[PDB]
């Protein structure tokens, strides 16, 4: 019943969340020629690890969906959840917040580091 790789790309963001594993899998799997193949293999690894580097820092590693403690800023978007989840593709959404992607990432990283600092302190008090 799978839509296949990127088959969800035209779907709404809410519907697309069903297929996250389809995209997550095959990120690693899918003489003049010999060197080009080697470059392709190294590049695919760097690509995969780039996203994993961010997830490990965010504490989101090992999860397809990761909730955070960073509040949404209305300046990033003023849309209601129905306007986003039931009326947009992820392709459209990425364009809407393309200028804020790095800003959001830094805020997530800051929140994770403070959270772990606090978790340690809570354990130290026990």
């Amino acid at each position, epitope marked *: 019943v799978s839509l296949g790789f990127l088959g969800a790309a035209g779907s709404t963001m809410g*519907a697309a969340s069903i297929t996250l594993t389809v995209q997550a899998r095959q990120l690693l799997s899918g003489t003049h020629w010999g060197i080009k193949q080697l470059q392709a293999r190294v590049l695919a690894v760097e690509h995969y690890l780039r996203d994993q580097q961010l997830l490990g820092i965010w504490g989101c590693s090992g999860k397809l969906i990761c909730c955070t403690n960073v509040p949404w800023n209305s300046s990033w978007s003023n849309k209601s959840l*129905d306007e986003i*989840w*039931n*009326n947009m593709t992820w392709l*459209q959404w990425d364009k809407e917040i393309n200028n804020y992607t790095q800003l959001i990432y830094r805020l997530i990283e800051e929140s994770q580091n403070q959270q772990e600092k606090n978790e340690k302190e809570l354990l130290e008090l026990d």
Partner: nanobody, 130 residues
């Protein structure tokens, strides 16, 4: 998004009429096209709706034998917008059918309320006389 409709015209009783609904500024296939009628003696009433994506339609019981809905194939403008048109045909017109006819755009691509008529065209008058 914007919707426009065929201009008002006079018909004889029993005559057929066809009303176009040209659209722009949004993807035509992403949303339902609704048709809604208003008359002085009835108020607003649904004629049902059609989905350009599947071609499926839901006609209200009152109109099932007299109303036919069709759509044109969409023509893209941008990767996220297109143009196209819906058409509705009414057969066996009566004086009771006189009033304003509206074309309207569906609300959402998903969720419980996808077909609601979020955007409306200006609407045009249909008149019947012998």
């Amino acid at each position: 998004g914007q919707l426009v409709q065929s201009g008002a015209e006079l018909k004889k009783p029993g005559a057929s009429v066809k009303i176009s609904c040209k659209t722009s500024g949004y993807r035509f296939n992403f949303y339902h096209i609704n048709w809604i009628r208003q008359t002085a003696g009835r108020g607003p009433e649904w004629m049902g709706w059609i989905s350009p994506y599947s071609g499926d339609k839901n006609l209200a019981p009152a109109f099932q034998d007299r109303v036919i809905m069709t759509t044109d194939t969409e023509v893209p403008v941008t990767s996220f917008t297109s143009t196209g048109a819906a058409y509705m045909e009414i057969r066996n017109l009566k004086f009771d059918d006189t009033g304003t006819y509206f074309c309207a755009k569906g609300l959402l691509r998903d969720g419980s309320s996808t077909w609601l008529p979020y955007l409306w065209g200006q609407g045009t008058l249909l008149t019947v006389s012998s």
